[PDB]
């Protein structure tokens, strides 16, 4: 109970401003980046489990799952990857300077394509193209479940999780989509962009659709 606030490294809060206020037209690349991160966290736990099998027991199923929640205008990208501890959330998701942050921005300025973001190692923030608020719910075998939240301001909060479903292991990227990005709540659109830029994913990508029984 009760959150802790942290300030974002100055260049990182710069990137977010840049991304959130970026009339860019190829916004669909955010799914590519998030699915890509999901697959990377699944690789880690798998590789890591090569000499530590028990690590898998917390969730034997390796997968990636997208769940749109229309009523809340939310879209969630989930994975049963290695997950992150509270330290790593605070550490890697905000307070510590990141290698490619400044470079990408300059590249972006020189006319670079926003889809290069992933090549600069800061693709997670691409999510701010379609969303104006996000929660990173994560659970690592080495710690408890926590919620990392941000609205692209200058500070972010980390809270012990007591309000969300329990994920065996992994992360959930809960994106509160912009009022004009609701198209990513639609099954067709989602399926469309997953096929366009995510053909070589090694884990099953599951889409959760809700339908009224006729």
Which parts are annotated binding residues? 33, 37, 79, 84, 92, 98-100, 119-124, 171
Residue nearer to ligand GDM on the CB measure, 43 or 187 = 43
Min CB(209)–its own copies separation in Å: 6
Q: How far apart are CA 184 and CA 108, in angstroms?
A: 25
Assess 82 for contact with ligand GDM (CB under 6 A). yes
Judged by CB under 8 A, the stretch of 99-107, 115-123, 124-132, 158-166 that binds its own copies is: 158-166
Report residue 143 as tokens: 């710690």
Among 6, 104, 124, 146, binds ligand GDM (CB under 6 A): 124
Sheet of 131-139, strand order: 4-7, 155-160, 146-150, 131-139, 170-177, 74-79, 64-69
Length of the chain in residues, anyone? 214
| Residue (171 or 181) nearer to ligand GDM, CB | 171
Least distance (Å) from its own copies to the CB of residue 165?
4
- Residue 124 contact partner, candidates its own copies, ligand GDM, none, CB within 5 to 8 A by sort of partner: ligand GDM
The separation between the first and the last C-alpha atoms of the chain, rounded to the nearest angstrom, is 43
Per DSSP, 34 falls in state: H
Task: Give Cα separations from 173 to 51, 63, 107, 120, 163 (angstroms).
Answer: 28, 14, 27, 20, 15
- Helix axis angle, 29-48 to 187-197, nearest 10°: 70
Residues that bind its own copies (CB under 8 A): 61, 65, 71, 162-166, 191, 194-195, 204-214
> Binding residues for ligand GDM, per CB under 6 A?
37-38, 40-41, 44, 79, 81-82, 84, 88, 92-93, 121-124, 136, 171, 173
């Amino acid at each position: 109970m009760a959150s802790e606030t942290f300030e974002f490294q100055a260049e990182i809060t710069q990137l977010m401003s840049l991304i959130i206020n970026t009339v860019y037209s190829n916004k669909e690349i955010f799914l590519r980046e998030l699915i890509s991160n999901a697959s990377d966290a699944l690789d880690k736990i798998r590789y890591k489990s090569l000499s530590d099998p028990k690590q898998l027991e917390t969730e034997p199923d390796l997968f990636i799952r997208i769940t749109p929640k229309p009523e809340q205008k939310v879209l969630e990208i989930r994975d049963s990857g290695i997950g992150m501890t509270k330290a790593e959330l605070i550490n890697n998701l905000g307070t510590i300077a990141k290698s490619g942050t400044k470079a990408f921005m300059e590249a972006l300025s020189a006319g670079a394509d926003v889809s290069m973001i992933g090549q600069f190692g800061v693709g997670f923030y691409s999510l701010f193209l379609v969303a104006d608020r996000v929660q990173v719910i994560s659970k690592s075998n080495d710690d408890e479940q926590y919620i990392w939240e941000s609205n692209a301001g200058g500070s972010f909060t980390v809270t012990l999780d007591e309000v969300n479903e329990r994920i065996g292991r992994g992360t959930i990227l809960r994106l509160f989509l912009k009022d004009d990005q609701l198209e990513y709540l639609e099954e067709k659109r989602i399926k469309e962009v997953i096929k366009r830029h995510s053909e070589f994913v090694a884990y099953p990508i599951q889409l959760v659709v809700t339908k009224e029984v006729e």
